Amino acid sequence: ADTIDATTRLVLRSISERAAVDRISESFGRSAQVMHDPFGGQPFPAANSPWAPVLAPFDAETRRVSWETLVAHGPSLYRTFAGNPRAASTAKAMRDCVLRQENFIEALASADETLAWCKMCIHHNLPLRPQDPIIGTAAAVLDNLATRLRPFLQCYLKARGLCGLDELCSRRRLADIKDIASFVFVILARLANRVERGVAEIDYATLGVGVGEKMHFYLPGACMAGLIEILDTHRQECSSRVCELTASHIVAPPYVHGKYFYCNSLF
Amino acid sequence: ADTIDATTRLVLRSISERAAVDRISESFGRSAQVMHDPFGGQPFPAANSPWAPVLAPFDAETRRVSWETLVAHGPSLYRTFAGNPRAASTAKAMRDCVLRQENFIEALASADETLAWCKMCIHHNLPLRPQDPIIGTAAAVLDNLATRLRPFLQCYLKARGLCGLDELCSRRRLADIKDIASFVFVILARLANRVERGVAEIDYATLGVGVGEKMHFYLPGACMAGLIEILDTHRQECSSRVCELTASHIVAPPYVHGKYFYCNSLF
Ligand SMILES: [Zn+2]
Ligand SMILES: [Zn+2]
Asked: Which family does it belong to (chains A, B) (predicted)?
């Protein structure tokens, strides 16, 4: 008979013996100290570089680049990442966390950031590497967008006649991509899978890109533009009030209702 | 040969033909209007009730209840939810969104909110229902905590000798629960699974609770206290700097580094 075993029950109750406001304060205190100098002795090199401000709140308009600017200046940033492996490792880990807690609009922007970066890599024939901080955090954007979009996609993907979110990200087949939602999820799932596998160089085909091809089907900004559009226009084809609430509240996140109480017996 | 088909490529590029700053503004505008009066004609009833302020920013300290208060006043809130099905449906959908975008500390608090509520239901022999707004959003807290904790749990759960996060939430067996992390993820995954199945009443065994039992192994606040503790103390057993960065940045989320550019060619 499936049961929580006797010993684990003791383990579970014993949190009560240790949990305390000052033990928690000293925890926030130790993790905060790690975040004070997270690169330690090894930050990315001081240099005169248009990338200096992001190599040291990120402001999208101030940090904005045209596609043409990314193609001209992207290789410099790429060489910085690859040529500073300790720094890139620290960056990767911090990027992974940031992207796992980003709001919806930020998470769209990060999907485009990741795909535009790969498109730039492809443009220059640069390999797509697991250690690259942008490529290697594909799973973070992926999981963030899955969390936030799942109940809406349950409805929308049925309306499109497509596989559900989990089957999409499980099969990971280019031939399943039929719209922008399947595109963002299938491509990011393929890319996250090849990262987790730790292939030294990730095949352009992972992105649906063939030999000598350039990814003409992906325009930078398409994840943002297209997913916001479907959150908007699906309600025209869908008679569910709950779905409409879901889509609306994704687009307009200020808190209104939904939280009832806080109960903490331990501290 | 697996490929993105010709027609879908056109579909993908055609976002460029529609995406525009004012189309986006009019989207934020329509979803914002839905959020202005999301209950419409059917909010929860005006009544003299300690729950009135959450039946209309949620402040945890002001909305705080002791375990004993939840047991005395919980049945009132429960009857409000069950006896107002349109309102509960709207609440559920808005709660689901809120919990899918909550920060880590909020998401811990919501795990405890959900488990303490079930424990109260069990205490009173009240059924656990899919339409109940707190029970029915178990998947939201679940996916939120998975997003944020996944790369840390990859390391920690290995250190404990347990199944990985996905196998835990896939097998959903009480006999897999060996610590606080497996507990929160296995129990919430079982509970989310029984919600998605739409059983009219969800068996107490879903929570590891047997016939006439009371869930003595779960103390309100255990998800918060215990997960913060493991983020703190795992670094004592683990020689990985990346893991330490990961845990630290989960506990201390202010942005520091990790975002490089914003590229949007469409608008
Ligand atoms: Zn719908
Ligand atoms: Zn570790």
From this structure: Belongs to the HHV-1 ICP27 protein family.
Q: Which amino acid type is present at position A92?
A: K
- What residue type is A79 in one-letter code? R
Residue A62, domain member (yes or no)? yes
Bridge partners (DSSP) listed for residue A128:
A202
Cβ of B34 and A95 within 8 Å?
A: no
Domain contains A65: yes
Per the domain annotation, does B7 fall within a domain? no
Kindly give, in sequence order, each residue whose CB lies less than 8 Å from that of residue B16, ignoring residues fewer than 6 positions away: A219, A222, A225, B265, B266
Bridge partners, residue A202, by sequence: A128
Q: Decide: residue B187, CB within 10 A, 0-12 exposed, 13-18 middle, 19+ buried.
A: buried
Instruction: Indicate the number of domains in chain A.
Output: 1
> Cα of B164 to ligand 2 centre, how many Å?
13
Min distance A114 CA to chain B CA atoms (Å): 10
State the residue range of the domain holding B112.
Answer: 42-253
Q: Can you tell me the distance from the alpha carbon of B63 to that of B75, in angstroms, rounded to the nearest whole number?
A: 17
**What are the C-alpha distances in Å from A188 to residues A51, A145, B81?**
25, 10, 39
Tokens 């959150």, located at residue: A231
- List, as own/partner pairs, every contact residues A34-40 make where C-beta atoms lie below 8 angstroms and the sequence separation is at least 24, other chains included: A34/B244, A34/B245, A34/B248, A34/B249, A34/B252, A35/B248, A35/B249, A35/B252, A35/B254, A35/B256, A38/A90, A38/A94, A38/B245, A38/B248, A38/B249, A38/B256, A38/B257, A39/A87, A39/A90, A39/B257, A40/A90
Q: Which of A24, A90, A96, A147 to mutate to test the interface with B (most CBs of B within 10 A)?
A: A147
Residues of chain A contacting residue B133, judged by C-beta atoms under 8 Å apart: 258
State the smallest CA–CA distance between residue B21 and chain A in angstroms. Answer: 10
**Residue of A104, A60, A228 lying closest to B144 (CA atoms):** A104
Method of determination is X-ray
* B129 inside domain: yes
